[PDB]
Scaffold this active site. Structure first.
Site, mmCIF file in Angstrom:
data_model
loop_
_atom_site.group_PDB
_atom_site.id
_atom_site.type_symbol
_atom_site.label_atom_id
_atom_site.label_comp_id
_atom_site.label_asym_id
_atom_site.label_seq_id
_atom_site.Cartn_x
_atom_site.Cartn_y
_atom_site.Cartn_z
ATOM 1 N N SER A 30 46.811 47.171 38.550
ATOM 2 C CA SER A 30 45.682 48.028 38.956
ATOM 3 C C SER A 30 44.847 47.546 40.148
ATOM 4 O O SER A 30 43.997 48.287 40.640
ATOM 5 C CB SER A 30 44.771 48.325 37.775
ATOM 6 O OG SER A 30 45.490 49.016 36.774
ATOM 7 N N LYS A 175 38.129 44.512 41.461
ATOM 8 C CA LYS A 175 39.058 45.323 40.708
ATOM 9 C C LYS A 175 39.998 44.465 39.865
ATOM 10 O O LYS A 175 40.619 43.517 40.347
ATOM 11 C CB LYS A 175 39.842 46.258 41.643
ATOM 12 C CG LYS A 175 40.798 47.210 40.930
ATOM 13 C CD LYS A 175 40.057 48.295 40.160
ATOM 14 C CE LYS A 175 40.988 49.038 39.214
ATOM 15 N NZ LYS A 175 41.216 48.271 37.957
ATOM 16 N N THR A 176 40.079 44.811 38.588
ATOM 17 C CA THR A 176 40.971 44.140 37.658
ATOM 18 C C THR A 176 42.408 44.636 37.801
ATOM 19 O O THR A 176 42.657 45.736 38.314
ATOM 20 C CB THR A 176 40.537 44.398 36.211
ATOM 21 O OG1 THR A 176 40.301 45.802 36.043
ATOM 22 C CG2 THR A 176 39.263 43.616 35.873
ATOM 23 N N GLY A 177 43.341 43.808 37.340
ATOM 24 C CA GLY A 177 44.725 44.212 37.134
ATOM 25 C C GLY A 177 45.214 43.639 35.818
ATOM 26 O O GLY A 177 44.984 42.469 35.535
#
Length: 240
Positions: A30, A175-177
């Site tokens: 993501s 932003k996370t992944g």
């Protein structure tokens, strides 16, 4: 496990902190919603923080918690995968591939799943596309400087829509992944990201935290990396 924290100065590019293996490329998961926003705004498909607003449809086949009406802000904050895929479908293969090549993004491999021809909608989702924390920091510095081959407005809009966090005196966006990979022994191993920037007084830093291996926890690896980085940042900052 395999863990990387990489921090550079946004303005000067000077590396400020590094721990662990940061030159090994993994699926962006993501975190790819960051370059996708640039693409979407440049393409004119995405308009602003709240437009376009798309309803979930069952044919999108999305995750249970993500089956809700989404705009660009909700997309980034809640990490709505189907919204990404609707975006790439609309932008089309020609433009998507042009953007990924232009951005010089990770290994640039958007083939997707080996026998599926699904790169347009799945390439970042733990298949073909790989990027290292180094590449992430490089990409994010470029974004903030408006140096990507896309309109300035598109890059500014992208910057404005990433969710906000705080860590002591630091104002953070990022932003996370969350994903997984098959490790050397055939086991499904967790993959976590948190990438973004942080601002305090005269300084702005760009960062990437990445975790890879070995055992899946209760908390998704992305948010876990996010919490770990936010927890660490004020201490790291002492040595800036």
């Amino acid at each position: 496990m395999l863990e990387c924290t990489l921090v550079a100065d946004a303005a000067s590019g000077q590396e400020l902190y590094r721990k662990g293996a940061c030159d090994k490329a993994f699926a962006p998961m993501s975190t790819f919603k960051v370059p996708l926003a640039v693409m979407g705004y440049d393409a004119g498909i995405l308009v602003d923080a709240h437009n376009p607003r798309w309803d979930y449809k069952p044919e999108f086949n999305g995750y249970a918690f993500q089956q809700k009406t989404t705009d660009p802000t909700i997309w980034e904050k809640d990490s709505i995968v189907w919204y990404s895929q609707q975006l790439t479908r609309k932008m089309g293969q020609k433009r998507f591939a042009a953007y990924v090549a232009g951005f010089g993004y990770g290994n640039g491999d958007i083939s997707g799943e080996p026998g599926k021809s699904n790169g347009l909608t799945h390439s970042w989702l733990g298949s073909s596309l790989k990027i290292s924390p180094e590449g992430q920091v490089r990409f994010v510095r470029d974004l903030l400087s408006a140096k990507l081959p896309a309109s300035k407005d598109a890059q500014q809009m992208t910057v404005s829509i990433l969710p906000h966090f705080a860590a002591g005196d630091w104002a953070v966006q990022g932003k996370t992944g969350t994903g997984s990979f098959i490790d050397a022994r055939g086991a499904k191993a967790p993959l976590g990201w948190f990438i973004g920037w942080a601002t305090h007084e005269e300084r702005r830093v760009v960062f990437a935290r990445m975790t890879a291996g070995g055992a899946a926890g209760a908390q998704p690896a992305g948010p876990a990396a996010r919490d770990a980085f936010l927890k660490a940042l004020p201490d790291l900052a002492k040595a800036f």
